[PDB]
Design an enzyme around this catalytic site. Structure first.
Site, PDB file in Angstrom:
ATOM      1  NE  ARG A  46       3.826   2.708 -31.090  1.00  0.00           N
ATOM      2  CZ  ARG A  46       4.657   1.794 -31.665  1.00  0.00           C
ATOM      3  NH1 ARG A  46       5.472   1.829 -32.459  1.00  0.00           N
ATOM      4  NH2 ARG A  46       4.546   0.428 -31.135  1.00  0.00           N
ATOM      5  CE  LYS A  62      -5.435   6.940 -27.355  1.00  0.00           C
ATOM      6  NZ  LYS A  62      -6.080   8.028 -26.749  1.00  0.00           N
ATOM      7  CB  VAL A 113     -10.181  13.128 -39.313  1.00  0.00           C
ATOM      8  CG1 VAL A 113     -10.633  14.481 -39.675  1.00  0.00           C
ATOM      9  CG2 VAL A 113     -11.284  12.530 -38.616  1.00  0.00           C
ATOM     10  N   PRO A 114      -8.297  13.432 -42.439  1.00  0.00           N
ATOM     11  CG  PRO A 114      -8.847  13.600 -44.816  1.00  0.00           C
ATOM     12  CD  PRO A 114      -9.387  12.957 -43.410  1.00  0.00           C
ATOM     13  CD  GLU A 117      -2.457  17.534 -33.766  1.00  0.00           C
ATOM     14  OE1 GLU A 117      -2.064  18.361 -33.129  1.00  0.00           O
ATOM     15  OE2 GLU A 117      -2.396  16.432 -33.427  1.00  0.00           O
ATOM     16  CG  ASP A 156      -6.874  16.261 -22.907  1.00  0.00           C
ATOM     17  OD1 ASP A 156      -6.212  17.053 -22.459  1.00  0.00           O
ATOM     18  OD2 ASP A 156      -6.095  15.010 -23.353  1.00  0.00           O
ATOM     19  CE  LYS A 158      -4.338  18.267 -25.362  1.00  0.00           C
ATOM     20  NZ  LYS A 158      -2.717  17.817 -24.842  1.00  0.00           N
ATOM     21  CG  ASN A 161      -6.903  16.203 -27.601  1.00  0.00           C
ATOM     22  OD1 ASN A 161      -6.039  15.517 -28.365  1.00  0.00           O
ATOM     23  ND2 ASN A 161      -7.247  16.278 -26.332  1.00  0.00           N
ATOM     24  CG  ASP A 174      -6.444  11.566 -26.484  1.00  0.00           C
ATOM     25  OD1 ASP A 174      -7.040  11.073 -25.529  1.00  0.00           O
ATOM     26  OD2 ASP A 174      -5.534  12.204 -26.482  1.00  0.00           O
ATOM     27  CB  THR A 191      -3.314  20.023 -21.375  1.00  0.00           C
ATOM     28  OG1 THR A 191      -3.647  18.745 -21.934  1.00  0.00           O
ATOM     29  CG2 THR A 191      -2.252  20.711 -21.772  1.00  0.00           C
TER      30      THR A 191
HETATM   31  C1  LIG Z   1       1.331  31.684 -29.404  1.00  0.00           C
HETATM   32  C2  LIG Z   1       2.050  31.738 -28.589  1.00  0.00           C
HETATM   33  C3  LIG Z   1       3.194  32.163 -27.507  1.00  0.00           C
HETATM   34  N1  LIG Z   1       3.093  31.034 -26.139  1.00  0.00           N
HETATM   35  C4  LIG Z   1       3.482  31.797 -25.214  1.00  0.00           C
HETATM   36  C5  LIG Z   1       1.738  30.698 -26.198  1.00  0.00           C
HETATM   37  C6  LIG Z   1       1.617  29.059 -25.649  1.00  0.00           C
HETATM   38  N2  LIG Z   1       0.720  28.173 -26.257  1.00  0.00           N
HETATM   39  C7  LIG Z   1       0.940  26.905 -25.310  1.00  0.00           C
HETATM   40  C8  LIG Z   1       0.301  25.575 -25.908  1.00  0.00           C
HETATM   41  O1  LIG Z   1       1.051  24.963 -26.729  1.00  0.00           O
HETATM   42  C9  LIG Z   1      -0.405  24.853 -24.885  1.00  0.00           C
HETATM   43  C10 LIG Z   1      -1.062  23.554 -25.548  1.00  0.00           C
HETATM   44  N3  LIG Z   1      -2.043  23.933 -26.665  1.00  0.00           N
HETATM   45  C11 LIG Z   1      -1.653  25.041 -27.549  1.00  0.00           C
HETATM   46  C12 LIG Z   1      -0.847  26.188 -27.124  1.00  0.00           C
HETATM   47  C13 LIG Z   1       1.825  27.012 -24.195  1.00  0.00           C
HETATM   48  S1  LIG Z   1       2.248  28.462 -23.926  1.00  0.00           S
END
Ligand SMILES: C#CCN(C)Cc1nc(C2(O)CCNCC2)cs1
Ligand SMILES: C#CCN(C)Cc1nc(C2(O)CCNCC2)cs1
EC number: 2.7.11.11
Length: 340
Positions: A46, A62, A113-114, A117, A156, A158, A161, A174, A191
């Site tokens: 976590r 972390k 970093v406040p 994401e 990684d 996305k 991150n 990460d 992912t």
């Molecule tokens: C927007 C929208 C509709 N969805 C079908 C879109 C989707 N977004 C995802 C994520 O969660 C995968 C991991 N990083 C961010 C996006 C999966 S499927």
């Protein structure tokens, strides 16, 4: 290409290798900090906001449970993460301040970093305009130029991150899948929505998988959703290996052309992995308005600044059940983590 870029990268590699060959260890301990709030959680660790008791500075700590790291086959991955983070230095990478271990856990104490994401801001706004997407994409292009010249693959990329800082710039966090790789590597990890075809097909693969993931990220920033998705991972993988991609009509012709060359299923034809390397991307027409030196120097005004009240504000992160940080009376997995 320009001698100034070549000499910058040569010095960056010399400074990385000195720290790589002689890593720092054991630079703080847990009772030097006050615990504030859980910021994220996973199957073996976590991330907690903490405050250093003597200086008053805030950090993102972390915490990895050694027994769960072993069970989920993450020993080498966690040793890669800490050894790489203590050796790198770049404007768009979160800095590692301290690391240490105890009877139960491994600890990496990072800058906090406040602003939250990128994923939260993307989902709240719907999609980013092309200039806004391009500002963030330029920072990732420069970060991968740096990492790949040190023989590092990130693995990684996305939106969850990428953290947004007090100036509106990106900090990549990460490094749990990052690795030093001089040729190819073979582990299945990452992912699902962001994996390149050669990972899914169990090939030996290289830095070209990061440039594939940059194509997925730019598509998701400009459309609001990723290009390959489905209810089950096998169905996602079938779409990826086909590589058939539909683009929204609002995408510019230059954006579609860049994405067809990053989302190229043949790794030997993919931008980033050709004779001219990163310069096929930096010189593409979609980046014609980008001042690469001004981005590196943080001299461009950002598209927005996150709303937050000060360095300890947690309003841009979400709420998790608050659990103990228990330390066993007996040492666990000592041999496995000797180098940490
Ligand atoms: C927007 C929208 C509709 N969805 C079908 C879109 C989707 N977004 C995802 C994520 O969660 C995968 C991991 N990083 C961010 C996006 C999966 S499927
Ligand atoms: C302990 C032990 C002996 N095991 C065979 C070691 C193992 N190694 C793995 C890896 O996935 C770690 C990352 N690099 C590739 C292999 C899984 S299990």
């Amino acid at each position: 290409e320009q001698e100034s870029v070549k000499e910058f990268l040569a010095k960056a590699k010399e400074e990385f290798l000195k720290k790589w060959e002689s890593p720092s260890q054991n630079t703080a301990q847990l009772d030097h900090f006050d615990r504030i709030k859980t910021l994220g959680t996973g199957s073996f660790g976590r991330v907690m906001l903490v405050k250093h008791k003597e200086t008053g500075n805030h950090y993102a700590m972390k915490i990895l449970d050694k027994q769960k790291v072993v069970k989920l086959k993450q020993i080498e991955h966690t040793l890669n993460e800490k050894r790489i983070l203590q050796a790198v230095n770049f404007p768009f990478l979160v800095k590692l301040e301290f690391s240490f271990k105890d009877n139960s856990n491994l600890y990496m104490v990072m800058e906090y970093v406040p602003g939250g994401e990128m994923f939260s801001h993307l989902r709240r706004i719907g999609r980013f305009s092309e200039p806004h997407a391009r500002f963030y994409a330029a920072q990732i292009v420069l970060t991968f130029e740096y990492l790949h010249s040190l023989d590092l693959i990130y693995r990684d990329l996305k939106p969850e991150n990428l953290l947004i800082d007090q100036q509106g710039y990106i900090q990549v966090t990460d490094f749990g899948f990052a690795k030093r790789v001089k040729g190819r590597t073979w582990t299945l990890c990452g992912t699902p929505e962001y994996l390149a075809p050669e990972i899914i097909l169990s090939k030996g693969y290289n830095k070209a998988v990061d440039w594939w993931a940059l194509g997925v990220l730019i598509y998701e920033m400009a459309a609001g959703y990723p290009p390959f998705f489905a209810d089950q991972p096998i169905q996602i993988y079938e779409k990826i290996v086909s590589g058939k991609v539909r683009f929204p009509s609002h995408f510019s012709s230059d954006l579609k052309d860049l994405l067809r060359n990053l989302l190229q299923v043949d790794l030997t034809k993919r931008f980033g992995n050709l004779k001219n390397g990163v310069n096929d991307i930096k010189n593409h027409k979609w980046f014609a308005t980008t001042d690469w030196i001004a981005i590196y120097q943080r001299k461009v005004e950002a598209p927005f600044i996150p709303k937050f009240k000060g360095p300890g504000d947690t309003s841009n992160f979400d709420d998790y059940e608050e659990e103990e940080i228990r330390v066993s009376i007996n040492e666990k997995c000592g041999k496995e983590f000797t180098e940490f």
